[PDB]
Structures are given as C-alpha cells and as structure tokens.
Scaffold this motif. Structure first.
Motif, short mmCIF file in Angstrom:
data_model
loop_
_atom_site.label_atom_id
_atom_site.label_comp_id
_atom_site.label_asym_id
_atom_site.label_seq_id
_atom_site.Cartn_x
_atom_site.Cartn_y
_atom_site.Cartn_z
N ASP A 1 0.82 -1.20 0.00
CA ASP A 1 0.00 0.00 0.00
C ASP A 1 0.86 1.26 0.00
O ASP A 1 0.35 2.37 0.08
CB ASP A 1 -0.95 0.00 1.20
N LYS A 92 -0.54 9.47 0.90
CA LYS A 92 -0.75 8.60 2.05
C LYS A 92 0.02 9.13 3.24
O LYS A 92 1.13 9.64 3.11
CB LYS A 92 -0.37 7.15 1.72
N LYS A 130 -8.44 2.80 11.11
CA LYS A 130 -8.39 1.54 10.36
C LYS A 130 -9.12 1.54 9.01
O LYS A 130 -10.33 1.78 8.95
CB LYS A 130 -9.00 0.44 11.24
N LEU A 135 -4.30 6.70 4.86
CA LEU A 135 -3.40 6.29 5.93
C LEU A 135 -2.35 5.31 5.40
O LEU A 135 -2.69 4.30 4.79
CB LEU A 135 -4.18 5.64 7.08
N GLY A 137 0.45 4.63 7.67
CA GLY A 137 0.79 4.00 8.93
C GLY A 137 0.91 4.89 10.16
O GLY A 137 0.64 6.10 10.15
N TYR A 138 1.31 4.23 11.24
CA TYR A 138 1.46 4.84 12.55
C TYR A 138 2.92 4.89 12.98
O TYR A 138 3.56 3.87 13.25
CB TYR A 138 0.64 4.12 13.63
N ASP A 166 -5.73 -3.98 13.90
CA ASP A 166 -5.34 -3.63 12.53
C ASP A 166 -4.06 -4.31 12.08
O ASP A 166 -2.96 -3.90 12.45
CB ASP A 166 -5.26 -2.09 12.35
N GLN A 168 -3.09 -4.70 8.91
CA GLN A 168 -2.80 -4.28 7.54
C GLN A 168 -1.94 -3.01 7.44
O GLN A 168 -1.12 -2.88 6.53
CB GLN A 168 -4.14 -3.95 6.87
N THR A 169 -2.16 -2.07 8.35
CA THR A 169 -1.42 -0.81 8.37
C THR A 169 0.06 -1.00 8.76
O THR A 169 0.37 -1.86 9.59
CB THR A 169 -2.09 0.22 9.29
#
Length: 322
Positions: A1, A92, A130, A135, A137-138, A166, A168-169
């Motif tokens: 992503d 993103k 989510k 987004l 990521g974190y 989550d 996936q992130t």
C-alpha cells in the motif's frame, strides 16, 4: 500500500506537514492559536510537486487530555480531515505521535504513565483510523530520548495493541537518542520489535549540524561536509541490512542560507534512492513563517529545498529497502 509514482517507482521522498504538534508546552491548547491543521491548499501544492508521502505530527495530549478520559472528538475529526484531504490528493499519511517517549512530561512506562495507557490510546486510534485510504501508517513515537530503558517495552506494548485491531497498516518504529541515524548501531544494537504481520519499518532522523540536533546554530553549522548526510545515514542503512529490516528517514532538513547543507542534502537523497529508502523533509505546511528549514512556499514561490528535492523524486524501486 506504499504510495507509487505515476511514471513508475515508489513515492520515497515526502514531507513533514505542520502543525498539530506545535507549542506542546501548551496543552490542550487551542487549534488556530497554539497549533494548526493543514488545509486543501497544502496537500494540493505538494501533490502538484509530485509528492505523495506525508508524515503528520500530532501529540498524545491533544487526542487524550488525561489517561482517565476518552479521545477528544474534535481532534480525531481534525486528524480524519487530514487523512481525507491527503487521500483525495493521492497522498498517504504517516501519523506521528510526536511525544518524545513522554505523556504530560512523564515517561511512558513510569508509574504515572503505564505501558497499558500507551497501548490503549493506540488501540483506540487504530480503531478510529483503520482502513482509511489516506493512511500509510502509525509512527507510534517520535524521538524517544532519556527513557532509562523504558522505550523498547513501550514500543512492543503499542505494536501488540495495534495488531489486535489492525493487521494491515504499517507501523514505524523509532529508536533511542532522538532516533539518531548515526548513533543507531550503538544505541539500538539489539533493538527488535515483534510483528507477525511483517508490516514494521525502523525510522531514524538525520540532521547535518555538529550536535546532530537540526537546530542549525551558528557555531555548529560551519564546515558542513557534503558527504555528512551519507556518512550519518550509512550506519543506519547497514544496521537495517544486517537485521533484514526496512527503513525510513523520517526527518532531515537544511537551512536556506547554508550552501554546504544543500550539497549534503543532494548526496543524502541520492544515497537513499540507491537503497530504495524513503524519507520525510522537515518541514512544510501552515505556521512556519520565515523558518529557514521550512519548505513551504512563500508568495507563490517555491523554496530552494523543494527545487533541490525534485531531482531525486524519480526511481525504479518496487520495494522499500534497504
């Protein structure tokens, strides 16, 4: 992503966008006074410049005023807006909890701020964000320093909590000593966070002044070697290669009035491309005034750092390195 370039290759080199973490001594503070959120114009300009990667600082104290209270509706709404606007402009976002290993001045992992508290806020945030298309990521914590051995356990506590909700992130993990790239192999020799999703990236910061601070004070900014950026990145890149991990240079920046820093920035971005390693410039967006580092345009005029950047936006990378 991970964001892609239209002509091929990855969106490796992006920009830090102000200014939700501004004046962190003033909490909660007031949006529009002490801190600022970006508007459509900022996202549109960077997209026009070919930039699809954004790191966005916010502080814990502004999403949660106290540990016994819930999340602030307005602040989440402001963060959602950021993600929405980013997404509409094909960007993103990496959300960065800009907290230096602390909450209301106390160390995360101290009795006043248990690991449990830090895990909760991220689990609640992951619940809020989510599946958002803007987004990426974190970045769970910015520039941990002087944590007295607390940080590694805090990082794992947040990662475990996020993954419950989550899988996936992407998660971005910084290291001790202000996440210095140059000091990484000494300070994080054996740093390793567990993630069954294989969606973790280690993130260091890198400035060119004598004290590694990015202040660019007069005495510490004389004699900048044009390879100082490569030299300070190499230790981090080699640590990542050895541990088979992906990397991100989450901060770097140069004052406009230092020709030597400009050369150092060019050589740095060239080196990161050769390794397919992404980065984020410090910084652009609202509220910077005439800050020398700032890459935000003035009077419609592109800043020298943006012009320096454009040469390095192209690549043929298919994966994040090194």
């Amino acid at each position: 992503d991970w964001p892609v370039n239209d002509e091929g290759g990855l969106a490796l080199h992006g920009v830090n966008i102000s200014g939700a973490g501004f004046a962190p001594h003033i909490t909660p503070g007031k949006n529009g006074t002490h801190y600022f959120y970006p508007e459509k114009k900022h996202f549109k300009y960077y997209a026009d410049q070919g930039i699809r990667l954004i790191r966005f600082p916010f502080i814990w104290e502004r999403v949660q005023h106290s540990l016994d209270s819930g999340l602030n509706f307005d602040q989440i709404r402001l963060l959602k807006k950021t993600l929405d606007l980013a997404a509409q402009n094909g960007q993103k976002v990496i959300l960065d909890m800009h907290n230096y290993g602390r909450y209301h001045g106390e160390l995360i992992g101290s009795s006043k701020v248990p690991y449990e508290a830090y895990a909760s806020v991220w689990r609640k945030l992951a619940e809020r964000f989510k599946g958002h298309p803007g987004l990426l990521g974190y970045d769970i914590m910015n520039e941990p320093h002087s944590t007295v051995g607390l940080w590694p356990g805090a990082a794992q506590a947040a990662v475990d909590a996020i993954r419950e909700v989550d899988d996936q992130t992407l998660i971005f993990i910084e290291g001790e000593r202000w996440s210095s790239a140059y000091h990484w192999p000494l300070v994080n020799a054996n740093f390793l966070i567990n993630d069954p999703a294989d969606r973790l990236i280690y993130e260091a910061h890198l400035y060119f002044d004598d004290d590694f601070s990015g202040k660019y004070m007069a005495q510490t900014s004389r004699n900048i070697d044009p390879m100082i950026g490569v030299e300070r990145a190499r230790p981090f890149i080699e640590w990542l290669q050895k541990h088979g991990q992906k990397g991100f240079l989450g901060e770097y920046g140069i004052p406009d009035d230092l020709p030597e820093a400009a050369q150092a920035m060019d050589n740095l971005l060239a080196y990161l491309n050769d390794n397919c390693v992404p980065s984020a410039y410090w910084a652009g967006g609202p509220g910077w005034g005439t800050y020398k580092l700032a890459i935000e345009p003035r009077n419609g005029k592109d800043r020298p750092q943006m012009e320096l950047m454009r040469k390095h936006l192209a690549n043929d990378c298919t994966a994040i390195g090194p």
